[PDB]
Amino acid sequence: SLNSRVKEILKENTLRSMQDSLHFKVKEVQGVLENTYTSMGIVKEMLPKDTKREIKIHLLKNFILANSHVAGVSMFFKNREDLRLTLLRDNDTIKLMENPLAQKAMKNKEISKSLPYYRKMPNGAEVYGVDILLPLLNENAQEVVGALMVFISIDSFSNEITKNRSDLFLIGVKGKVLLSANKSLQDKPIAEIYKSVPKATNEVLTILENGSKATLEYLDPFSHKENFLAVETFKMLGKAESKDNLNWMIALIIEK
């Protein structure tokens, strides 16, 4: 008898310890984004200052070199044709000459972000990432003079999500898998992938809209064994306010 009272107490503790482990991982991903956004704020303020084009390229280059999860940055200046540049990682950085999200951002004077997409890199590879768009202001902090685009590599979060583990999912807009040990799931919705357990995907998709966190059980269509699932949301753009600031999600699974 008391065996069975012990087994329900231990299951409670398994679920809560799983939730703590997920929370630790969420904070780790938020802290990567926050390191990047701190540097990005400083570049945003310094890029429109009264500096030669070459200073500005040094600034963008050192921003990317310092931020491992940034795969490229772009500046566009309204009234300067020599300040419309992209930098992308290759071995070090490659400079290349030459906009709805950016047009929006300059007009609302507000940080924007794109949906996840693949972008080609100097060595023919394709990096899955999101653009973050920021207005650049003149000295008086009122006139918009340009835009800064930061390409955040979602693949870079392999250091946090898939490194020596395969039990973690990074989930994004509308249930899309952004990153997971199984690269075949990238860019596909959990509603498609996990159609065999509709209560689960729909409980998960609720938590993703509502923010919040939760645990459940579901039958994994790949392993065919029963799995504990724990999910937890955070705001990808952090504090901000922008209409574009959505919940991302990290999911953690454990075989029952």
Query: What residues line the site for a second copy (CB under 8 A)?
Result: 20, 23-24, 27-28, 31, 34-36, 38-39, 41-43, 45-46, 49-52, 55, 58-59, 62-63, 66-67
Residue type, 197: V
Which is nearer to a second copy, 52 or 225 (by Cβ)? 52
Q: Which phi-psi region, left, alpha or beta, contains residue 237 (left: φ > 0; alpha: ψ -120 to 50)?
A: alpha
- What's the CA gap between 79 and 8, in Å, rounded? 67
- Cβ 31 to a second copy shortest distance, Å: 4
Q: Is 198 helix (H, G, I), strand (E, B) or coil?
A: helix
Write down the least CB distance from residue 112 to a second copy, Å: 19
Given a contact cutoff of 8 angstroms between Cβ atoms, the answer to whether 61 and 75 are in contact is no
Closest contact distance (angstroms) between CB of 250 and a second copy is 15
16 vs 174, which CB is nearer to a second copy? Answer: 16
Residues 227, 219 contacting (CB under 8 angstroms): yes
Angle at 212 (CA atoms; ends 207, 213), nearest 5 degrees: 80
Smallest gap from residue 79 Cβ to a second copy (A)? 20
Least Å distance, CB 124 to a second copy, is 29
Count of residues making up the chain: 256
Query: Taking the chain, what is the end-to-end CA distance rounded to the nearest angstrom?
Result: 21
Q: In whole angstroms, what is the distance from residue 178 CA to residue 191 CA?
A: 14
Q: Which is nearer to a second copy, 67 or 156 (CB)?
A: 67
CB of 18 or CB of 177, closer to a second copy: 18
- Tell me whether residue 123 or residue 159 sits nearer to a second copy (CB atom): 159
